[PDB]
Symmetry: C2
Subunit: 281 residues, 2 copies
């Protein structure tokens, strides 16, 4: 079971899940969720958070094979767990309006708390809002969103990075001074601003490009990525604070980020703290 | 293959492929592709067929499970095979721009010609055009599209039926008197016109709602459809000509339709014929 060959995904031809060996290395049956206790949660009932998920599971590799990916379930659910306990609700959307796609092979199958949160929001993940509608009717100056959460997973590398709709959402978050929460490959979505220097100088942590060039060696992916989101973010003004991963998180004003799936819990704590602080006043 | 239990799709939670039993009844290792010989095929190198495929594989059932579907490969590749033989090219697009999703469980693995056709357009199916780009520059008054092809498969029931972009394509096709080719569940895409009476009085064949209501009994789908595309088509003026399925195709002006996966070959011949007759007009 310590095999390094990518595992074929029967749902799609020439598609592969991470090899068994890489799975034993980067996934676990339980998550490290902890410290999700907030004595004074938000009771206002107005402020919620918008989640922009990935609507595609299959990412094209340089060799033509499809990496069977999507949003990373730990990177998505842990931050949501803390924010949920902090008293905030979530609206879930995708660009196409099609179901959010998770990397189910990374789901902690024996983690009761994490599974219970997905259960709470499964109807929304499976039948999300279409982002265009949210832009049309739920943003603007008096939106009920206190922030936007863009989870990682390689699924975030598709659509989001060059979507005018994502650009609209980011422009709104900045113009209305809202929280922008992301981690790992999630920050690839920030590239949607194009050459609009909206994020010049911002400091973030994100999944290291170098590691993406390395995981295929143990079959985590069936080929290599066709572009590097890290260098692109740097090209438009972001300062990447990390070169490795350790579950590190960082807050630059209202921009909260995490470096990888290891940062799921730390990010949840970080954001819960920031959001509660703002409503506290 | 006697097993009638829906088969778990490992890529997605609570998603199921058709039961082994239903597959033995509705799919085969080879197709009935035949008579794809056109003595004098089109050689002008201009006219093309626009293909609008399905970008989503998971359809929500009435019981909350997902039917692991997509476009039906036979319904898709046979009409294309003939038109290819006829000398016409194709542009493949999806609403989101995400990869066309095929019901791979129905692909004839032992069909040489069919598999070779897929290989030829493999890159376009996996990395299709986004419909909005096609609408911005490929339509108009002097388009190179001689017709539009919308293949079936239950994947066609998602996105297409209420897409404003599909509406633009169909209103355009009708205004410019272009061929509209579809079969089985593909005609559900015609509902995109909403309340435009454009199709009043048209005769077409399509997969019967009555049949959809029963396939779940043998595990073809993990639940039942949440709506009936046939009844809605009738509600906007379409006259459904078929009660069951037999490979039946019909031509009413430039509306060319087939009744089910069985109509793939005949629709290809019908389309090839109609298009060849016009180009020589």
């Amino acid at each position: 079971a310590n095999d390094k060959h990518p595992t074929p995904d029967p749902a799609e031809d020439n598609a592969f899940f991470p090899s068994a060996y890489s799975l034993s290395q980067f996934t676990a049956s339980k998550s490290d969720l902890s410290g999700a206790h907030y004595p004074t949660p938000y009771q206002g009932g107005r402020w919620k958070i918008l989640v922009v998920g990935a609507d595609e599971r299959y990412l094209m590799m340089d060799n033509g094979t499809f990496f069977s990916t999507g949003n990373h379930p730990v990177e998505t659910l842990l931050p949501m767990y803390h924010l949920d306990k902090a008293g905030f609700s979530f609206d879930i959307a995708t660009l196409s309006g099609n179901p959010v796609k998770f990397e189910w092979w990374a789901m902690p199958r024996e983690d009761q708390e994490v599974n219970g949160l997905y259960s709470k929001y499964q109807s929304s993940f499976r039948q999300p809002l279409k982002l265009s509608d949210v832009i049309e009717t739920a943003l603007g100056e008096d939106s009920d969103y206190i922030g936007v959460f863009i989870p990682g997973g390689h699924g975030a590398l598709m659509g989001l990075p060059d979507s005018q709709e994502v650009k609209a959402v980011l422009q709104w978050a900045m113009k209305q001074n809202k929280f922008i929460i992301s981690l790992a490959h999630g920050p690839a979505a920030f590239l949607a601003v194009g050459d609009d220097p909206l994020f010049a100088g911002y400091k973030i942590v994100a999944f290291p490009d170098e590691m993406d060039a390395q995981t295929p060696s143990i079959g985590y992916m069936p080929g290599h990525l066709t572009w590097k989101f890290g260098e692109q973010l740097q090209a438009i003004g972001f300062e990447l604070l990390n070169t490795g991963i350790s579950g590190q998180v960082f807050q630059d004003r209202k921009m909260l980020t995490g470096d990888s799936p290891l940062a799921g819990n730390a990010l949840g704590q970080l954001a819960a703290k920031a959001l509660l602080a703002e409503v506290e006043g």
